[PDB]
Design an enzyme around this catalytic site. Structure first.
Site, PDB file in Angstrom:
ATOM      1  CG  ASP A   1      80.008  59.459  69.428  1.00 13.22           C
ATOM      2  OD1 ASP A   1      79.756  59.440  70.651  1.00 13.22           O
ATOM      3  OD2 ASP A   1      79.373  58.713  68.657  1.00 13.22           O
ATOM      4  NE  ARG A   2      79.852  58.212  75.050  1.00 16.00           N
ATOM      5  CZ  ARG A   2      78.720  58.306  75.741  1.00 16.00           C
ATOM      6  NH1 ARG A   2      78.437  59.408  76.433  1.00 16.00           N
ATOM      7  NH2 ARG A   2      77.857  57.296  75.739  1.00 16.00           N
TER       8      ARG A   2
ATOM      9  CD  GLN B   1      84.713  56.354  83.812  1.00 10.81           C
ATOM     10  OE1 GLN B   1      84.005  55.367  83.611  1.00 10.81           O
ATOM     11  NE2 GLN B   1      84.930  57.287  82.883  1.00 10.81           N
TER      12      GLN B   1
ATOM     13  NE  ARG C   1      66.021  54.208  69.616  1.00 14.70           N
ATOM     14  CZ  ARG C   1      65.975  55.383  69.003  1.00 14.70           C
ATOM     15  NH1 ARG C   1      67.042  56.178  69.023  1.00 14.70           N
ATOM     16  NH2 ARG C   1      64.874  55.757  68.353  1.00 14.70           N
TER      17      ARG C   1
ATOM     18  N   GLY D   1      73.611  53.795  74.207  1.00 15.78           N
ATOM     19  CA  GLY D   1      72.426  53.078  73.752  1.00 15.78           C
ATOM     20  C   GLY D   1      71.266  53.901  73.202  1.00 15.78           C
ATOM     21  CB  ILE D   2      70.347  57.421  73.607  1.00 18.52           C
ATOM     22  CG1 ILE D   2      69.755  57.193  74.990  1.00 18.52           C
ATOM     23  CG2 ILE D   2      69.543  58.523  72.942  1.00 18.52           C
ATOM     24  CD1 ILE D   2      69.945  58.353  75.943  1.00 18.52           C
ATOM     25  N   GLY D   3      71.337  56.102  70.556  1.00 19.38           N
ATOM     26  CA  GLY D   3      71.382  56.298  69.114  1.00 19.38           C
ATOM     27  C   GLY D   3      72.231  57.485  68.693  1.00 19.38           C
ATOM     28  CE  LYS D   4      77.010  58.870  72.525  1.00 21.92           C
ATOM     29  NZ  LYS D   4      77.772  57.937  71.654  1.00 21.92           N
TER      30      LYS D   4
ATOM     31  N   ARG E   1      77.123  42.654  71.204  1.00 24.46           N
ATOM     32  CA  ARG E   1      77.713  42.128  72.431  1.00 24.46           C
ATOM     33  C   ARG E   1      79.226  42.380  72.467  1.00 24.46           C
TER      34      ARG E   1
ATOM     35  CD  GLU F   1      77.444  48.084  75.992  1.00 26.07           C
ATOM     36  OE1 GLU F   1      78.219  49.067  75.862  1.00 26.07           O
ATOM     37  OE2 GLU F   1      76.359  48.001  75.370  1.00 26.07           O
TER      38      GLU F   1
ATOM     39  CE1 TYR G   1      78.407  43.370  84.171  1.00 26.99           C
ATOM     40  CE2 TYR G   1      78.778  42.301  82.034  1.00 26.99           C
ATOM     41  CZ  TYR G   1      78.025  42.448  83.202  1.00 26.99           C
ATOM     42  OH  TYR G   1      76.887  41.672  83.402  1.00 26.99           O
TER      43      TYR G   1
ATOM     44  CD  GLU H   1      81.155  55.759  72.419  1.00 25.76           C
ATOM     45  OE1 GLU H   1      80.994  54.630  71.901  1.00 25.76           O
ATOM     46  OE2 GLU H   1      80.725  56.057  73.549  1.00 25.76           O
TER      47      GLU H   1
ATOM     48  CG  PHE I   1      86.159  54.595  79.688  1.00 23.09           C
ATOM     49  CD1 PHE I   1      86.140  53.723  80.774  1.00 23.09           C
ATOM     50  CD2 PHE I   1      85.532  54.213  78.509  1.00 23.09           C
ATOM     51  CE1 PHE I   1      85.509  52.472  80.678  1.00 23.09           C
ATOM     52  CE2 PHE I   1      84.913  52.958  78.402  1.00 23.09           C
ATOM     53  CZ  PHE I   1      84.910  52.096  79.491  1.00 23.09           C
TER      54      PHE I   1
ATOM     55  CB  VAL J   1      72.507  57.474  78.733  1.00 24.47           C
ATOM     56  CG1 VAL J   1      72.708  56.089  79.324  1.00 24.47           C
ATOM     57  CG2 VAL J   1      72.225  58.476  79.823  1.00 24.47           C
TER      58      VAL J   1
ATOM     59  NE  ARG K   1      75.315  49.797  73.718  1.00 23.44           N
ATOM     60  CZ  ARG K   1      76.161  50.738  73.308  1.00 23.44           C
ATOM     61  NH1 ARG K   1      75.775  51.666  72.434  1.00 23.44           N
ATOM     62  NH2 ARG K   1      77.405  50.750  73.776  1.00 23.44           N
TER      63      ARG K   1
HETATM   64  C1  LIG Z   1      82.737  57.367  77.667  1.00 27.24           C
HETATM   65  C2  LIG Z   1      82.523  56.190  78.597  1.00 27.24           C
HETATM   66  C3  LIG Z   1      81.862  55.043  78.188  1.00 27.24           C
HETATM   67  N1  LIG Z   1      81.690  54.032  79.065  1.00 27.24           N
HETATM   68  C4  LIG Z   1      81.029  52.787  78.630  1.00 27.24           C
HETATM   69  C5  LIG Z   1      79.538  52.899  78.343  1.00 27.24           C
HETATM   70  C6  LIG Z   1      79.381  51.905  77.186  1.00 27.24           C
HETATM   71  O1  LIG Z   1      79.276  50.613  77.770  1.00 27.24           O
HETATM   72  C7  LIG Z   1      80.709  51.923  76.442  1.00 27.24           C
HETATM   73  C8  LIG Z   1      80.741  52.782  75.176  1.00 27.24           C
HETATM   74  O2  LIG Z   1      80.309  54.116  75.435  1.00 27.24           O
HETATM   75  O3  LIG Z   1      81.665  52.354  77.413  1.00 27.24           O
HETATM   76  C9  LIG Z   1      82.188  54.113  80.382  1.00 27.24           C
HETATM   77  O4  LIG Z   1      82.013  53.162  81.168  1.00 27.24           O
HETATM   78  N2  LIG Z   1      82.831  55.210  80.822  1.00 27.24           N
HETATM   79  C10 LIG Z   1      83.027  56.246  79.988  1.00 27.24           C
HETATM   80  O5  LIG Z   1      83.623  57.269  80.378  1.00 27.24           O
END
Ligand SMILES: Cc1cn([C@H]2C[C@H](O)[C@@H](CO)O2)c(=O)[nH]c1=O
Ligand SMILES: Cc1cn([C@H]2C[C@H](O)[C@@H](CO)O2)c(=O)[nH]c1=O
Lengths: 333, 331
Positions: B118-119, B82, B172, B15-18, B178, B181, B58, B40, B85, B13, B176
């Site tokens: 990262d991911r 989505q 955490r 915000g965890i510090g990855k 602003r 998001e 958002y 990222e 992303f 997830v 973050r």
């Molecule tokens: C990787 C990914 C991040 N995000 C969002 C979560 C965080 O707000 C931001 C950075 O990871 O983007 C998505 O909404 N979909 C995704 O697939």
């Protein structure tokens, strides 16, 4: 366990030219030749399996936009999502069948033990139709890149047959098929026709050993004028010796993908590299469909001696037969 | 003259510090053997194109939750954002996948080269889509479309799913920057559950089980199931998971079954593909409740357990260039 030779053919091209009917005749015993399996367009996946009908939805989105119940920005986004949903059942089918073709791809020249005919390759929904929509201004380059990135790599032994037909007879075929006074999106068809010639040219271009960087520097940027040409009826054709400007790569040289100095960003160059590699294993042919369905099937079948075959086995061939029966049954009406 | 590579996908997830952990691991200040970090793809998401997908996804929920936009339209537009992303992940994965080499083995040694991504593509093609579906922001059709774009992981992959207690997580998230998001706790809870489903799926598969194992007995996952999956701590890491603890369970819904209640063969194929694609991910989890230095140390303690591949010098050099390029263009 016992070895089986397979030719797989993805029959592709603009909707309405007679591809599906040709493919069905190929699979019919009446056409003779090789025992043949046919995998139809995933019509039910598109139209009836879920709440939304993506075919109605993509055409209806453009209508909502032109009248003004839906903003242009929103429409561009909704169009891209519909175009995404077209690809889904192709990606699923490709993932399932690619494990069964086997390897040892070669041009053997002999008749296979069996032939597979897929109605379209994943390139149709991830590349061709998205490109057409982009060229017509119905979705952005960003959205195009998103669909193009999802093109799956073709494993060894693929053959693609792009269908061709003089435009007057093409529109005639769409007309007979259409209801009482139904309109035909002529502009879309003109663009898709060029996009499929670009595809054919791209495959020819790569088979000659050339790469997208060859002639890239010298290529004009593809802005307003390129787009006009790309929607222009009969503007593109299959080339004997295609150069970069005849291929799918040319549309990607736009400002949106360049830095201040006009150089493609490396991340975008990587995308084009991926596109290039994914298309490598496609042995490309074209087939005119002006004859009867029986004749069309024979035209395609007569390509088999030039096609790639792979070596599979009886258990995998049996799984493919089960796959075809299942896909025909589940994708129906 | 082979180069031994260990590649790690740090995921979990937001915000965890990855990302902080990843930067520390690759920092020369942390010593060790040569380590590269691929961030990222923020610039791709935010600035390279006319639309910013993080604010856009958002903003879409905001227009839905108000006047501007109808719920049917928002669901399609949310699915489109989505998809966007995933793009830079798919491109990076296509670029790097042939460079890693073969001969995947748990060698128990220090690698010549450590890669920290990262991911993994699973985050944007499966995990985040699944969260959006479970929350009712996207349909199962839309989820299937994202899931089918997951690329196959070739041999040698390691995934480290980051974990953190809810309280520190919330703390955490407040730190973050602003950037417009979405940051609500019902989303967080769902993502945390979905990432537990992912870890559990990997444990499930490595246990020698397949998604049909327990499928018949599994309850149909309809309205109740979706509600449970949004409940904070409804799911946890189980090394001996039930099918209901994995990502597979959310697909036993009415939308995918015939009238007799049997999953359609085409949807069964989509689960097979998912199963196969996750096969080569050696799965680990790491708690990030320490300092950036402590976190990196926790991840590094996992290296001797991880799969390594054998690559040649040229391939390693190209990976080195790829991290340089990616950092440069994505920041
Ligand atoms: C990787 C990914 C991040 N995000 C969002 C979560 C965080 O707000 C931001 C950075 O990871 O983007 C998505 O909404 N979909 C995704 O697939
Ligand atoms: C394969 C494909 C078909 N179509 C349309 C054209 C026809 O109207 C219908 C069936 O081919 O679907 C798309 O819009 N996009 C696609 O990617």
């Amino acid at each position: 366990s016992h070895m089986v030779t397979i030719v797989r053919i993805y029959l592709d091209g603009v909707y309405g030219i007679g591809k599906s009917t040709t493919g069905r005749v190929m699979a019919s015993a009446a056409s003779g030749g090789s025992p043949t399996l046919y995998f139809p367009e995933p019509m039910a996946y598109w139209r009836t399996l879920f709440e939304t009908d993506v075919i109605s939805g993509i055409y209806d989105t453009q209508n909502r936009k032109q009248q003004g119940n839906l903003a242009v920005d929103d429409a561009a986004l909704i169009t891209a999502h519909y175009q995404s949903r077209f690809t889904t059942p192709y990606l699923i089918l490709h993932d399932h069948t690619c494990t069964l073709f086997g390897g040892n791809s070669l041009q053997r020249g002999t008749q296979p033990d069996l032939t597979l005919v897929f109605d379209r390759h994943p390139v149709a929904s991830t590349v061709c139709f998205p490109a057409a929509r982009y060229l017509l201004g119905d979705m952005s380059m960003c959205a195009l890149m998103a669909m193009v990135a999802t093109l799956p790599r073709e494993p060894q032994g693929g053959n693609i047959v792009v269908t061709t037909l003089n435009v007057e007879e093409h529109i005639r075929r769409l007309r007979t098929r259409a209801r009482i006074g139904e309109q035909i999106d002529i502009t879309l068809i003109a663009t898709l026709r060029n996009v499929y010639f670009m595809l054919v040219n791209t495959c020819h271009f790569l088979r000659s050993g050339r790469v997208w960087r060859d002639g890239w520097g010298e290529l004009p940027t593809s802005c307003g004028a390129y787009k006009h040409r790309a929607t222009q009826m009969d503007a593109f054709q299959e080339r004997v010796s295609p150069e970069l400007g005849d291929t799918l790569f040319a549309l990607f040289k736009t400002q949106e993908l360049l830095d201040d100095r006009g150089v493609i960003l490396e991340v975008h160059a990587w995308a084009l590299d991926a596109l290039m590699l994914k298309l490598r294993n496609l042995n490309v042919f074209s087939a005119d469909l002006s004859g009867t369905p029986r004749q069309c099937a024979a035209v395609v079948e007569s390509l088999l001696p030039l096609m790639s075959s792979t070596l599979s086995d009886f258990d995998s061939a049996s799984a493919l037969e089960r796959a075809a029966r299942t896909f025909n049954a589940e994708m129906g009406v």
